[PDB]
Symmetry: D2
Subunit: 178 residues, 4 copies
Amino acid sequence: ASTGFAELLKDRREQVKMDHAALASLLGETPETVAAWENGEGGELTLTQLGRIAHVLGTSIGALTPPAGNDLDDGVIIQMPYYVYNCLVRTKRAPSLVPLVVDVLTDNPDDAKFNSGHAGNEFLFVLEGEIHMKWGDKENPKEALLPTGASMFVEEHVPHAFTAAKGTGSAKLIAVNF
Amino acid sequence: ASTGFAELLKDRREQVKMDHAALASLLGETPETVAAWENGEGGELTLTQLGRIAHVLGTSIGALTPPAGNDLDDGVIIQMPYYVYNCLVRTKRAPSLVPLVVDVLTDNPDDAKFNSGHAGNEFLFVLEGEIHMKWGDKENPKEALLPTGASMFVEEHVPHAFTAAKGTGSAKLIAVNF
Amino acid sequence: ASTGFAELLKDRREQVKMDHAALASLLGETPETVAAWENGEGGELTLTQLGRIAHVLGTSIGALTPPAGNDLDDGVIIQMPYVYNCLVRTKRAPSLVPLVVDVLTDNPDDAKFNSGHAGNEFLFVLEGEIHMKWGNPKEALLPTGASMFVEEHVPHAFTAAKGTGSAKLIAVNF
Amino acid sequence: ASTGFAELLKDRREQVKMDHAALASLLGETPETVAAWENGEGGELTLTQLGRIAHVLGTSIGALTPPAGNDLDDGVIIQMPYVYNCLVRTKRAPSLVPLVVDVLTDNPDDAKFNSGHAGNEFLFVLEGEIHMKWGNPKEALLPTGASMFVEEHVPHAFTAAKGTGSAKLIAVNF
Ligand SMILES: C[C@H](O)CP(=O)(O)O
Ligand SMILES: C[C@H](O)CP(=O)(O)O
Ligand SMILES: C[C@H](O)CP(=O)(O)O
Ligand SMILES: C[C@H](O)CP(=O)(O)O
Ligand SMILES: [Fe+2]
Ligand SMILES: [Fe+2]
Ligand SMILES: [Fe+2]
Ligand SMILES: [Fe+2]
């Protein structure tokens, strides 16, 4: 984080044609301190201070910090084996990827509590049982009965909810947010 | 396609400050014909001709044609239920999404024929049996044994191959390219 | 175009697990015809036909066609020297449209609005003084040397300052 | 920053099915502390600590922090008027760095190279004549009014034409 910030900070400062002294003057620091940050010593900078640094450099904290990181072994990562979520493999190389095996333990559609929508698309596959899906306007939603083997796609932000089909006991589906 | 091209063409032409006559002069057409295209009559234009139109407008055919389209019902789309691929739900709103249930009928790892890699990331989940996965350099690859319930992530372009574990008969996995 | 399409078609087809025959039936074509397109023989396909091919493959025409192309000389392109005088453009950055605009009207009371662009815009006052209007509009009198940024979709108009005759701006859309 | 982080933290946490206690244990914090961060009280978290929070949540610090912000006035920002004279910039388009460069060296034999930028660059010769070098370099003598495009990462240098004293360019990085 500190090494990444060090590199990114120096890139942005040079990009806006500021020297150490110029940047220091806008941040209540000495140019020696800014030089220190560009040397990896920014580790203890606060979120608040980071916001100010991003601001004077006309950018975001995100632009001054390193990407999530690489946790892959030559391109891949493997994970061994009302609602219980069994989280599947995730990776910093694709942060929005959140795959899950969901056991649905309520078979009363009236218990379907709607989301407000997701950032990111979602793919679903019914592994066991039958699912009663609802989506859209929670006040008056669309509905579908998804039997085992059915597959579904839910676009970003579309609110949804589901339970197992009425009186069918329980259902299991795999849900992949990407 | 014609209506979309009509709108996009007129947008680009105006964006580069060209009038009908100017654009027509670069394409061996009359300005009336270009006006016609911007009126939805470009339907019979050839791929070759489209390439030339994109070229003189300093852009790509893609920039002059409409996006894939919307096949969703209020945000969602549902599909009812050596290798056999059972294609799951797809959508033009997320073209790169290609989910599959793969039945692996060869349990001889020596039969694993490597890919050359995918455009797009890939999430996998072993539904049945045990999978013998290989990835990377086909000449000397990485390998892992994925039992039922295991989940895996393969980064874009990483070549891979798989069969069921030696002498285990057959395996089944769900593979989601996104 | 034909060769780029041949490569992208094959890739997409393989991507959706379709063999020549599978794709051909959906289009009402023979499998040899599809093989021919992937052999670079798709040059005469019409826009409408491309739309059908993209549709059955669940994608766009753009996803099956090559990028703009490269017109740079080792990464560079140069151009030697209301009236629009178009500056250098490149297929490597299509949305870049730099211009030298001659503003020949100096009656702000009669400026006309450009309902907004798709894309941001950077401007620099080359000569004279400009009277800019945007967004009961927001306004600004801008002397030579002044610079400005206009966000995508923001409507705006320009005129030379009241009775100053004319002015020049550099406008860079990107 | 604190409020943006509070919102993004909660969203990401919910996204990975973690309740306050689940996230707190991984960080060696109490669940009340996490609740406090989502209550906008994360202002004093250090860069290193943010790195740990992002790590356990399998994302980047950037994904948990707000966008640059808005400094426009109804979509517009203006700026009234080798030496770099910085023109208008905006947090709504951070990579836009327009400049008026005073080229005070007129000995091409002694130009020095900028090993390439991250991002494209558009240039326009304001005054005098420029001697550009890029990429045994490629070269070009550019009179006033000439314009040019330099693709990302392409090394380049500028000097006024041999013995012409000085020149001025407008360089727009985007
Ligand atoms: C829990 C929420 O109500 C449903 P999810 O997050 O699985 O989409
Ligand atoms: C068939 C190829 O060899 C493997 P896939 O396309 O499932 O990744
Ligand atoms: C400079 C101006 O932005 C040119 P217009 O938008 O009116 O085409
Ligand atoms: C105009 C030039 O591109 C400025 P530099 O790249 O040398 O910083
Ligand atoms: Fe969901
Ligand atoms: Fe694959
Ligand atoms: Fe404009
Ligand atoms: Fe440069």
